[PDB]
Subunit: 267 residues, 6 copies
């Protein structure tokens, strides 16, 4: 019912606490397996590398999905995109090990050329339906001034895949060959400007930064002079709001708030 | 009139632009509207979004036509219902919901749920209807609604605005003209499902009919589901209500046509 | 980048100020310092003059080369049932050539994608990069694709495509045939967003306003007297909005940020 | 109509299928046709392809409507003519060519020369017209013409056949119905520009008018060009002529609608 | 590695010795086949007789239906959504009459079947799961075939067969269990250039009854024209096979579907 | 001279006098040609012999490779990214053996070559720069060609040739220096309807060695079947040219690629 209620603030608090059982305090309660979905090789480590270490240690299985092949990411006129792909595959495998990640799916869409297509949704759902994960981390597609199409696409496609994985009529051949529908229990947005849940990474920062530099191709010493200070400044932004030094921010909301929720911004 | 060049305050020029130049009436914005389109992504989006307001407009004697972008093919967790069945069902569910609110005509584009293109082709389909029904008003979902993760919603919002904007251009889908349909300018644009509403409608009296017209969509709202949705729908009506100083309201964003293009102060309404 | 350790910082506000001033050398005060050549990228014929026509005059006068890229052909922009889109294109080409001269713009590239039908495709990125790589410009102006309530697809597309083209122009693996036929990669030094609701850098145009408005009306097809009764007051009201924030009468606003902030920068909004 | 199962020769069943079951009339195939569409990829394709036949049909009192798929934007080597100019020009050139042959109405889709999609959207546009003009006949270029390297031609051929086939299905572009246009079945399909024609038309009397109506397209045929095209166009008319036992003829391939689907003996006509 | 100097010699040696191409008994070691149909009814109309004979000889036959049949009615009262639901049941009944147990439905909309990468990926996924020995698909080179769903299905089928064995193609299929697969046999049905026939004179009455199972597609109005047609087709194929009623197929070695200028000579 | 009443007369006069079509020595004034190949190896397999002979007679030959060869291995250990890198080196070595110095790589992915406007624009850009006299491309009408990248390359090549001289097509090409260009000669390789041949009996062993340069595509397993095939192809072409081993091409006037119902008669 809820007919008896006359205040919005009352109905809001009752909707989150009683109806949805939304737990912002310990939101990872029953999570044994998560997917981290990264646009490019290095996006998971840069975005939430610290948190992935902490989850790996607490004994939680972490699987990467890498949307693109990193083909474009060099100014060096001597490295063909084909070489760079081969390289950045090895660089992610090394970064992965340092953080405790064992499995990585490679979609192999070309860097800069990631469709916001039905086909890519179907690919992501196939994996979600197989690995039956409890949680999914994906980049916030509403991050202001994000000018990289592969990031915007990955964010939207991830949410669509999460939302449609439980619908048996969606990519129905997945069912006809064994894969049953699946509902993810937890959705975390990384790389967000409106985080509502933080993770202290002050202890783990040095490992995070070493696991980033594992991506040698992306971070020679030239480049690293600018990126190290940046990455620290990011951790401090998140830290300020979490009252620690170095933190990683995430936006966590109930699945319901990703649809026709005009008060979604109030968490 | 007197010279606009003479103005030195923005606040002055702004108030003069809205009141004198545009004649923008936030007070009674539906003044001369005899016919409106409500554009819904899925079967149930009109009734959930602005079902109350549709009843009130139907009663005040205003013709209300639905355009449904998709067929609802995907919207069941029941492994026994093919998308083809569910479409057939949700067509009947919208026809029943429609009658309860006083809506007589519904156009079905029949784009598949989850597979609504943001294509030129879909704009052409919407314009064709607008040009035929010559409506005074169009309601459509705010495509800028924060955290809206459903592509069919984002698409419908953008496509609707594009269709409104391009319906009056004779060079757009010119075959429409060559077969009878003359260009048309809509007089009124309302965004429903918005987090930035500037105009409200008391629905406290009509809430029980609205909720009954939602449950008409049996396939979407068994009792399991309805335990969570009823409280939600009420919480939404209260959010809108708070800002309108009533209990249960429906919010809309209404702006002048001009503000949907290169208007850096559009947010200030 | 002096004596001090970046690890030793415990305040965000400190690290932020040090990132912008020392690491990035971000100059919001005089951001155009060493710019001899800019591209202005416009969705339709008239978008450059309406958006930043004043600023283009001032840059032309200070001796800076300004090149237009026009994404579309303006084919759709008339209610007159007698003008075919093919006529209107031909017309608006001449109207932009006249507007261009009044502002000191000599070169204009026409992509000739049809008005209302501008793809957000790879192909269009390749076209923009080709030009950037040829003209090796120091600066690019493009419309803010995050402008609230912008309902025109050609505007949203142009904004995104422009940023992508800027970002990918320096990657030799992107449209590699461009290289194989002479065009070397290029890094733009400056990015300005026009038509933005979050400007951080202004330009007094109070002196230039009357020329700007005359250069807009050069687009006769788009601004008969009927229409102009509503647009003149609007355009002035816009200049005042920007003016208020710049403490002058009539200004043009731009959003200028470091290249890095267009990617995974959660504090990008704080500028 | 008497006892099909007891046939044991193919040749018998074939002759009975064409004569009795389909009533296929290769002799006088235009019997009851009062209105036809000629579908041309570019401005000039109808006059070059079947200009003579169009004159003869116009004279015998039959209404002939052009559909032009593209705008001709690309068709000049002159570095001074923008595609926008050339479109405007070739529109006037087709209007003058049209009058010389007795054609009053022309639909312009305005897809750009070289950029004609083989999309669903273009089928929907063609069906809209077919459903309005309710024509008895449609002429379109044979998409199986060997070594045809122009995509706009291949596309137009396929799209035309699809539009003919789908015009009578009420579930196809259903909004067409919801706004007045009822389904329509075309009675006659003619392929022009074909290497396997089965029906000819003497144009020996009309040739000089045809050639004058081609040159109406000044932009496409200066004197330089015309030195090579006039002899070509005559050589084509002779190829068709040889098979029709006249001097100058126009060839068409006419088959029953059914043979455009899963007909392994389609080639035997 | 012979320096042979006649083409006719090298040709006969290529087919018989190098490729072991058996036009005589080409189904030798086939325990499982896919029949790929554009629309519900295309398998039964095309090769319904042959499917019965393969079912009886104990061979597993699986249907893949590309489209939903949404468009296939002139009746202004039947929504495409109804017609889909109906034609699903009609194919299930037709299927049983011929001994077909499993049917995959891609549910691409009738008239709207993309020739996209995405559709290739869908077909490969199935091929890689069912590991079939054989695939039947409609000849995309059939002259005057004006139905896009048919042309598309033909091309997509061949592409799927060709790419199913490449581990780099739709690599996620592998990462979740499905290993690459090489089909051993490719049959084109609905072809004007058949090189292998099947007597269906005994089975014809069942075939025709299994077609009429598709009530929506064949009321009595329509059936007056289709029955004679379907018989005339069987006779065309029959004439070349020296029986009354036959079904024709084009069977070639995998290799001949690529850069083979003498492919036509079989 | 309108007053002709035989077709055969007008036809012979059209080819000889009006068009000056020279099937006898069609390469007369050609100093530079493009060979357009779908995959790395398609030029050497298709017309490798002819490329050697043109290189020797002092004619510049440039390759355009549409795809990256990413898919072309059954080996589950080679990522497509590795295979691309490899086949680049394999084509560079094959190229040198035949006298080819320059190669353009479009880097569209194997199996994923769009028949898009964008790809036409890419090909025209090159044609307009290199101003070649001749272009060789695979016959898109080759019967039973089931590889989409081949069909696409054929069509795209013809479109690029046809549109390179139109200043309104990809107009930015002009605005940055590249003037329009008309190719003088079009040769279709990999065709079943050739009208012009080239003896390669002398060059065969080099051709075959230049093919095997593509190690990734031709281990010894594979080569057992391909060597006999490649010889059988050369013999097919040879038979019609009255030599042992030949390469066939279809050469027609530019005009015959449009609305020419007698195009087949050459
Ligand atoms: C798009 C833009 O202007 N921002 C730049 C980023 O694109 C860029 O990120 C890197 O871009 C490459 C090009 O596509 C990618 O291959 C690479 O994966 C990606 N790296 C990350 C961090 O995801 C960064 C750093 O090069 O600079 C921005 O300015
Ligand atoms: C996108 C997301 O994660 N949010 C969920 C919504 O997608 C979902 O909305 C319903 O989605 C179906 C799938 O396409 C539609 O058929 C149906 O019309 C739609 N309902 C509405 C209100 O339009 C809702 C309901 O399950 O839950 C969200 O969390
Ligand atoms: C309502 C909406 O979505 N936007 C309208 C605009 O379309 C329109 O702007 C003009 O649109 C034409 C059609 O695409 C363009 O050709 C024309 O250049 C464009 N003008 C500018 C400034 O770029 C305006 C003006 O009528 O109204 C908007 O509301
Ligand atoms: C495909 C090819 O290379 N053949 C040429 C034709 O494509 C070409 O056709 C002409 O193409 C122009 C640009 O697409 C069109 O504007 C023009 O209408 C069209 N001609 C006709 C009569 O349809 C012809 C003519 O230049 O030459 C062929 O060689
Ligand atoms: C293009 C044309 O004129 N040929 C017609 C066929 O397209 C048509 O095929 C039928 O099309 C329906 C709509 O796409 C399908 O639902 C239906 O399954 C299909 N029939 C078969 C046997 O597959 C046929 C039959 O109406 O008539 C041709 O003339
Ligand atoms: C389509 C089909 O069934 N025929 C096969 C050909 O497709 C195949 O060609 C090869 O395909 C690979 C995958 O795309 C390519 O990487 C490779 O370049 C290509 N070979 C050539 C000659 O270019 C051939 C050989 O693998 O076998 C046919 O059976
Ligand atoms: Zn990234
Ligand atoms: Zn919805
Ligand atoms: Zn504009
Ligand atoms: Zn043409
Ligand atoms: Zn069919
Ligand atoms: Zn190849």
């Amino acid at each position: 019912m809820f007919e008896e209620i006359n205040d919005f603030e009352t109905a809001f608090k009752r909707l989150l606490n009683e109806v949805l059982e939304f737990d912002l305090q310990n939101p990872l309660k029953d999570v044994k397996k998560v997917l981290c979905i990264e646009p490019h090789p290095d996006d998971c480590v840069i975005g939430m590398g610290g948190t992935i270490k902490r989850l790996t240690d607490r004994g939680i299985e972490v699987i990467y999905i890498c949307m693109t092949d990193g083909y474009m990411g060099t100014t060096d006129e001597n490295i063909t995109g084909h070489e760079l792909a081969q390289i950045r595959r090895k660089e992610e495998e090394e970064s992965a090990k340092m953080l405790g990640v064992k499995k990585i799916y490679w979609l192999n869409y070309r860097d800069t050329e990631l469709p916001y297509s039905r086909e890519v949704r179907k690919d992501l759902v196939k994996i979600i339906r197989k690995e039956k994960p409890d949680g999914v981390f994906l980049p916030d597609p509403w991050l202001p001034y994000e000018a990289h199409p592969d990031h915007r696409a990955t964010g939207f496609l991830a949410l669509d895949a999460v939302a449609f994985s439980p619908l048996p009529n969606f990519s129905n051949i997945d069912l006809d060959i064994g894969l049953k529908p699946h509902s993810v229990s937890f959705i975390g947005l990384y790389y967000t400007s409106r985080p509502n849940y933080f993770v202290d990474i002050t202890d783990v920062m040095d490992l995070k930064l070493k696991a980033i530099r594992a991506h040698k191709s992306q971070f020679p010493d030239d480049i690293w002079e600018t990126w190290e200070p940046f990455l620290r400044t990011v951790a401090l932004y998140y830290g300020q709001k979490a009252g620690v030094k170095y933190a990683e921010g995430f936006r966590i909301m109930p699945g319901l708030f990703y649809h026709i929720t005009p008060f979604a911004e109030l968490i």
